[PDB]
Amino acid sequence: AAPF
Amino acid sequence: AQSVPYGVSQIKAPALHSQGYTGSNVKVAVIDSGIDSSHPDLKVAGGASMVPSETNPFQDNLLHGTHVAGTVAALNNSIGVLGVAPSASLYAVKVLGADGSGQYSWIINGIEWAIANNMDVINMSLGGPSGSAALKAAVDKAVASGVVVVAAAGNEGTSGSSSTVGYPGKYPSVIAVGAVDSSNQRASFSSVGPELDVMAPGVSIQSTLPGNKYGALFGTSMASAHVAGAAALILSKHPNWTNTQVRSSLENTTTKLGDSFYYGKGLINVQAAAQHHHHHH
Ligand SMILES: [Ca+2]
Numbered sequence: 001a002a003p004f
Numbered sequence: 005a006q007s008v009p010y011g012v013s014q015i016k017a018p019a020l021h022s023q024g025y026t027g028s029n030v031k032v033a034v035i036d037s038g039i040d041s042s043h044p045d046l047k048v049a050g051g052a053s054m055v056p057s058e059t060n061p062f063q064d065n066l067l068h069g070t071h072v073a074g075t076v077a078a079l080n081n082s083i084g085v086l087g088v089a090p091s092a093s094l095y096a097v098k099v100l101g102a103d104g105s106g107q108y109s110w111i112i113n114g115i116e117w118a119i120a121n122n123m124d125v126i127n128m129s130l131g132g133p134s135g136s137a138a139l140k141a142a143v144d145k146a147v148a149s150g151v152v153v154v155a156a157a158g159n160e161g162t163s164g165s166s167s168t169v170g171y172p173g174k175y176p177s178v179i180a181v182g183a184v185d186s187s188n189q190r191a192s193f194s195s196v197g198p199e200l201d202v203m204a205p206g207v208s209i210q211s212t213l214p215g216n217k218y219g220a221l222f223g224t225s226m227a228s229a230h231v232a233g234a235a236a237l238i239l240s241k242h243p244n245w246t247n248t249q250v251r252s253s254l255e256n257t258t259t260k261l262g263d264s265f266y267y268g269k270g271l272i273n274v275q276a277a278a279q280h281h282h283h284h285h
Contacts, residue, residue: 001131002104003037
């Protein structure tokens with residue numbers, strides 16, 4: 001994941 | 005002087021503040037890059053870091069979790085901004101490394117931490133492009149335990165006729181939040197698909213940033229923050245509502261906008277949500  | 009970012013007003017948070025509904029005693033996990041606890045406009049209650057290299061969840065290296073936190077619960081005072089739920093008990097759950105990514109295992113660790121430490125609301129202002137059965141199990145378990153689970157829908161825009169909603173946003177147990185601007189127009193980056201549940205302000209959102217700063221960010225992360233804060237306002241008026249009742253209150257009282265594939269149910273109205281859950285009865 002990564003920041004949205 | 006305190007500024008109330010327009011997004012807080014756009015969702016009708018201030019009408020609830022005046023009645024004494026501010027998120028008091030509601031525990032909100034910001035599952036993200038951490039939260040700067042030294043910020044004068046944030047009161048961090050606790051939290052955890054699930055990042056191997058990064059033991060401190062109060063060190064926000066990505067300047068992201070702090071911004072999300074401030075939309076959820078920036079303090080009501082004479083400085084800075086104002087949270088949707090300015091009395092909420094704020095938890096820094098760091099699952100994103102300084103490099104800009106995190107493992108789903110670290111997200112699951114945060115979710116399991118949030119169940120074990122009795123968070124009322126999980127906000128996952130993050131996601132990845134592919135699923136995992138493990139991540140779904142984890143958000144399903146959080147929902148089974150009565151946690152309101154909010155996630156950013158993703159920033160992938162349109163892709164022909166396909167859902168571009170990220171994970172864990174895409175899972176039915178999760179409230180998937182897309183981004184509108186101040187005109188209630190969908191932000192071009194906002195992920196689309198039938199998994200989209202609601203919209204909230206996601207463009208030019210002023211919030212807290214590390215080192216006693218403020219700034220505007222854009223993303224479905226900002227939108228999800230509004231909805232997690234909204235969940236906290238609702239629970240500060242209706243503490244025994246189930247997570248399902250809280251979800252229905254937000255989804256069933258929206259301002260309808262465009263097609264459900266692009267806007268879900270439309271823009272949340274936390275004042276309308278706080279009247280009644282509209283789940284069954
Ligand atoms: Ca403030």
